Design an enzyme around this catalytic site. Structure first.
Site, PDB file in Angstrom:
ATOM      1  N   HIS A   1      14.777 -25.777  23.229  1.00 38.07           N
ATOM      2  CA  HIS A   1      15.087 -25.227  21.919  1.00 38.07           C
ATOM      3  C   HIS A   1      14.433 -26.152  20.885  1.00 38.07           C
ATOM      4  O   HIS A   1      14.309 -27.356  21.104  1.00 38.07           O
ATOM      5  CB  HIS A   1      16.603 -25.149  21.718  1.00 38.07           C
TER       6      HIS A   1
ATOM      7  N   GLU B   1      22.959 -23.287  20.528  1.00 36.16           N
ATOM      8  CA  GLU B   1      22.605 -24.697  20.701  1.00 36.16           C
ATOM      9  C   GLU B   1      23.720 -25.651  20.276  1.00 36.16           C
ATOM     10  O   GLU B   1      23.684 -26.835  20.625  1.00 36.16           O
ATOM     11  CB  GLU B   1      21.316 -25.052  19.939  1.00 36.16           C
TER      12      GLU B   1
ATOM     13  N   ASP C   1      23.174 -19.741  25.405  1.00 35.08           N
ATOM     14  CA  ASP C   1      24.277 -20.290  24.622  1.00 35.08           C
ATOM     15  C   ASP C   1      23.753 -20.621  23.232  1.00 35.08           C
ATOM     16  O   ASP C   1      22.544 -20.647  22.994  1.00 35.08           O
ATOM     17  CB  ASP C   1      24.788 -21.608  25.218  1.00 35.08           C
TER      18      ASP C   1
ATOM     19  N   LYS D   1      26.835 -14.211  19.254  1.00 32.77           N
ATOM     20  CA  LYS D   1      27.002 -14.032  17.826  1.00 32.77           C
ATOM     21  C   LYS D   1      27.484 -15.348  17.206  1.00 32.77           C
ATOM     22  O   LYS D   1      27.046 -15.750  16.126  1.00 32.77           O
ATOM     23  CB  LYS D   1      28.039 -12.929  17.623  1.00 32.77           C
TER      24      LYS D   1
ATOM     25  N   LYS E   1       2.590 -46.496  14.954  1.00 29.38           N
ATOM     26  CA  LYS E   1       2.382 -47.158  13.681  1.00 29.38           C
ATOM     27  C   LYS E   1       1.622 -46.170  12.785  1.00 29.38           C
ATOM     28  O   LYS E   1       1.929 -46.014  11.607  1.00 29.38           O
ATOM     29  CB  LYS E   1       1.546 -48.418  13.920  1.00 29.38           C
TER      30      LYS E   1
ATOM     31  N   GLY F   1      18.014 -12.981  19.265  1.00 31.94           N
ATOM     32  CA  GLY F   1      19.062 -13.822  18.711  1.00 31.94           C
ATOM     33  C   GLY F   1      20.456 -13.207  18.700  1.00 31.94           C
ATOM     34  O   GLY F   1      20.761 -12.321  19.490  1.00 31.94           O
ATOM     35  N   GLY F   2      21.306 -13.682  17.795  1.00 32.47           N
ATOM     36  CA  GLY F   2      22.656 -13.163  17.700  1.00 32.47           C
ATOM     37  C   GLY F   2      22.756 -11.893  16.879  1.00 32.47           C
ATOM     38  O   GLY F   2      23.806 -11.250  16.868  1.00 32.47           O
TER      39      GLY F   2
END
Lengths: 395, 396
Positions: free
Chosen positions: A252, A164, A162, A135, A86, A346-347
């Site tokens: 993640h 997400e 992978d 990528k 609340k 990362g990619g």
């Protein structure tokens, strides 16, 4: 036993609010309770522990309240509903931290593997780890995904996760990725002598997670990518407590921005991405580094790391700064986080002129340079991949 | 089929269209400038499409993007990660609406009972409903519960709910509460012809919810109060989809303020407490009224009701405005939410001079005065309980 909750109230007599939250949010309006009810509901009455006043333009105050543990069952849903249910709708109030009692901690699993376990699995204890991402996955056939995986591995990354948004669309099924990924990583290992782990995305209906995660385990999956804030910390906890799922969990931050980004509402990054993720079974916890495309203020990044590594009745969690990190940032990342963290390239690794291999080697080379106290310029001259990455992304 | 996502962007850059396009391609197919144009064809169907871009303290923009449903599985977790996963961390972006395809809606349960169902359950169709909560429980015994149910029921309250903070207690265990509360309510009905339902808090580990709820159903539970944002929309959906839980679900907004209160981040109130709750099974959806201490902007409160009630592929969700409401606010409430909403008089009935029965009476009296266009001053003089509530918290 008691659970301490710390909050940041941005504006609205804060001492008044502190008391009301302590009593009203634990026992409700207490001055209206019949003496008898008032004399037995005392053990359920919360209490204000501290009311400090915090460096911005708005008048903010930090408040810590103790909640009798007998007030709620030992689980996260009950806890958050009690200390921030609340209350989360009451103006500008943000839940900044929680300190659990030894008893409550006894009901939380913590990461199955934690830093120690992952490092043990990789035989690497003298260096922060390197993580890489595909990528892109959407609309790409198994063949495409597989090569991306090979290239990331040959690049020298310790972990490949992978995307997400890699769901069960029939292009590259969950169980098939785990199988092919395992094979590919054994092949890259035979070629390089370097071990890589593949974090496979765990998705679908909450009720099917258990069986899917167990299946992943019997298939030998290396790690399970899990978007907690799309399923709930409790669901993750259930996974981490399952002995039939002897696989690490990578949390993640997908969607977490919805309740942490605001400087006035929701949760602090450290509590959500750091403490709760850890207590609930996250072996890895991803978050935006302080220097990328999307970023977190250093203070917040450092706090998450501290929550992941601090000595506690749980295995330590591997903090993983992410979002658009480039090689030139490693010295910064390593200065702040030390060696117990994972650099999520990362990619972006695939955008390297020399492909994912060059991106990975660019990252591995500079982290080594930093550890060996070797001038980056000098390292850049011995590893062209690093120099290319530095010329493209800078610093 | 695709699903439309509408975002509110604050300080999105100089070229909003470019930004919209970066989001559209970035959250879908990304840069395929390396395939090249032989597969780029087969992937065009996975490409996000910008549907609209409208610009307007700081610079803001409203953007709607279309995402091919083939990009993700037919579940909420997958859906939210696709449209607001990483984006939720990218600056000031707020997801204000989602428009599902009929294909996706077929995959959702919607409310099992909805407005019609619960009204049918009470036999009340021409009057907004009255809801109340216990005074000092969460450490109370069954007797205090049986007595509070009795007082509120006799006061004309249509439904009573546990506190969302009432968990497993040795004195008043889940199943026993359901069983005892059911009997006392059968009794008050026998003596007044007025029906009243009891919403019991469904808690525990996620993995135990299903069996626990299936157990409530067998016991005759009237409704399950569920703190959905403490477990996840997908969990509630799993409950609502289970035919062995033929029990209405009451979604409490606990923890949701953390996702909606900010005007620049998170989700909009209407989308979370409104459309998503309803689409995922909520029969009732609680939220702070625009008038109490804990308030919600009038516009958002109304928007939630709109989402709850709009004609759709699903039954309607009973909107339940709540935070610190009193009788004087009823006229405003009925003006804003009409007949199909529940007035959660919280403790605005227990703190009444003549106890919860008087408080409930005060509420029933004024909602009736409004419906029959009878002045609150005239109705008051006729109902001593209304006079008292008004003279205590403020007149109409």
């Amino acid at each position: 036993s008691e659970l301490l909750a710390t909050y940041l109230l941005t504006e609205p007599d804060t001492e008044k609010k502190a008391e009301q939250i302590a009593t009203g949010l634990t026992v409700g309006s207490w001055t209206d309770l019949p003496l008898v009810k008032q004399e037995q509901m005392q053990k359920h009455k919360g209490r204000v522990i501290k009311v400090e006043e915090r460096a911005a333009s708005e008048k903010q105050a930090v408040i810590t309240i103790a909640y009798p543990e007998i007030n709620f069952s030992q689980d996260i849903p009950a806890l958050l509903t009690t200390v921030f249910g609340k209350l989360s709708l009451d103006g500008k109030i943000k839940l900044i931290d929680l300190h659990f009692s030894e008893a409550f901690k006894r009901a939380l699993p913590g990461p199955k593997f934690g830093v120690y376990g992952i490092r043990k699995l990789l035989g690497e204890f003298e260096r922060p780890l390197l993580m890489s991402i595909f990528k892109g996955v959407i609309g790409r056939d198994l063949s495409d995904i597989k090569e991306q995986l090979r290239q990331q591995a040959l690049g020298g990354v310790d972990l490949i996760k992978d995307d997400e948004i890699f769901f069960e669309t029939g292009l590259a099924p969950f169980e098939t990725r785990i199988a092919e990924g395992k094979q590919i990583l054994k092949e890259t290992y035979e070629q390089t002598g370097h071990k890589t782990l593949y974090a496979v995305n765990l998705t679908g209906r909450t009720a099917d997670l258990k069986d899917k995660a167990r299946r992943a385990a019997e298939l030998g999956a290396d790690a399970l990518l899990f978007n907690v804030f799309a399923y709930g910390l409790d669901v993750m906890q259930g996974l981490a407590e399952d002995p039939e799922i002897p696989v690490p969990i990578m949390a993640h931050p997908a969607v977490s921005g919805a309740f942490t980004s605001s400087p006035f509402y929701g949760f602090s990054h450290a509590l959500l991405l750091g403490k709760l993720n850890r207590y609930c079974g996250a072996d890895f916890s991803l978050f935006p580094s302080p220097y990328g495309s999307v970023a977190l203020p250093r203070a917040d990044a450092l706090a998450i790391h501290e929550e992941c590594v601090r000595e506690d009745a749980f295995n330590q969690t591997f903090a993983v700064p992410s979002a658009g990190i480039h090689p030139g940032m490693v010295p910064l990342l390593m200065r702040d986080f030390g060696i117990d963290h994972i650099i999520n390239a990362g990619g972006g690794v695939h955008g390297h002129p020399n492909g994912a291999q060059g991106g990975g080697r660019a990252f591995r080379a500079i982290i080594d340079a930093v550890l060996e106290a070797q001038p980056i310029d000098e390292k850049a001259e011995q590893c062209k991949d690093l120099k290319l990455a530095l010329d493209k992304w800078g610093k």
